[PDB]
Design a protein around this ligand. Structure first.
Ligand SMILES: CN(c1ccccc1/C=N/c1nc(Nc2ccc3c(c2)CC(=O)N3)ncc1C(F)(F)F)S(C)(=O)=O
Length: 260
């Protein structure tokens, strides 16, 4: 898991994290072809507390092995401390959707929702609660492949417009509150990267949700898919489906779209 710094060709900065800049780059793997990687850097990792907190983000990702969750490639524990992650070449999902808009067929938008449900069903199997499921934290590996981005790099692991009522009211975060967030993420995909409750103040969102109001059916969204979103948005968390159920229904919805 230790990587030697001379085996890294550092490229363009692709974002800013809590500990430092994130770069795109190449990892010259021994006896293998070079890999496209994402480099999480750390500015203040000279302090033992900062370094321990930063390296804990790599340990979090190390425990996951799923094709739709970014992989930890390795770490560089010499100063400056770097975390080497798998690169998703095409970048952030919200930007990809805004550029490609209706040129992305429905079969592709449903495929993205399905792929995310397989990663979230995998996290659920390992009893891990994400807390920040949103299109902002999804990345694009290729035209037919999306992935959950780095967990440390995710800002809220307050996004009130994505949160379940029990998370807003009592700060309760469970796999059921992740399902509510995933429903909002599915809505964002079908809306081509448009943010939920745009132009609505965060305090009024809570009132609307309690009153039974939900995000509208996106244009050209299959009714079976909008029905699946409304099940994620059941006020009572015990009435919301689990990720394995969402995965099965999304698979059926994807097959039906491919048929026509
Ligand atoms: C939103 N994410 C970030 C948040 C804070 C800082 C950086 C990130 C992106 N990280 C990553 N980005 C890519 N590919 C990528 C390629 C080109 C561009 C971009 C992203 C953005 C941009 O403009 N061009 N692949 C892997 C990761 C990593 F493993 F680190 F997560 S997240 C929570 O990790 O998904």
């Amino acid at each position: 898991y230790e990587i030697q710094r001379e085996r890294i060709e550092l490229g363009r900065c692709i974002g800013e994290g809590q500990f430092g800049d994130v770069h795109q780059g190449i990892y010259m793997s021994p006896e293998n072809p070079a890999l496209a990687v994402a480099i999480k850097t750390c500015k203040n990792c000279t302090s033992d507390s900062v370094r321990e907190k930063f390296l804990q983000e790599a340990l979090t990702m190390r425990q996951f092995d799923h094709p739709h969750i970014v992989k930890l490639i390795g770490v560089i524990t010499e100063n400056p401390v770097w975390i080497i992650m798998e690169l998703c070449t095409l970048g952030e999902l919200r930007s990809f959707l805004q550029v490609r808009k209706y040129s992305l067929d429905l079969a592709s938008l449903i495929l993205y929702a399905y792929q995310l449900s397989t990663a979230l069903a995998y996290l659920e199997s390992k009893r891990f609660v994400h807390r920040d499921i949103a299109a902002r934290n999804v990345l694009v590996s290729s035209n037919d492949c999306v992935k959950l981005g780095d967990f440390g790099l995710s800002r809220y692991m307050l996004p009130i417009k994505w949160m379940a009522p029990e998370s807003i009211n009592f700060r309760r975060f469970t796999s059921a509150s992740d399902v509510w967030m995933f429903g909002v993420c599915m809505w964002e995909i079908l809306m081509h990267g448009v943010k939920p409750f745009q132009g609505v103040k965060n305090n009024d969102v809570i009132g609307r949700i309690e009153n039974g109001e939900r995000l509208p059916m996106p244009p050209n969204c299959p009714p079976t898919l909008y029905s699946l979103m409304t099940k994620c948005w059941a006020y009572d968390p015990s009435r919301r489906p689990r990720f394995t159920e969402l995965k099965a229904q999304l698979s059926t919805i994807l097959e039906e779209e491919k048929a026509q």
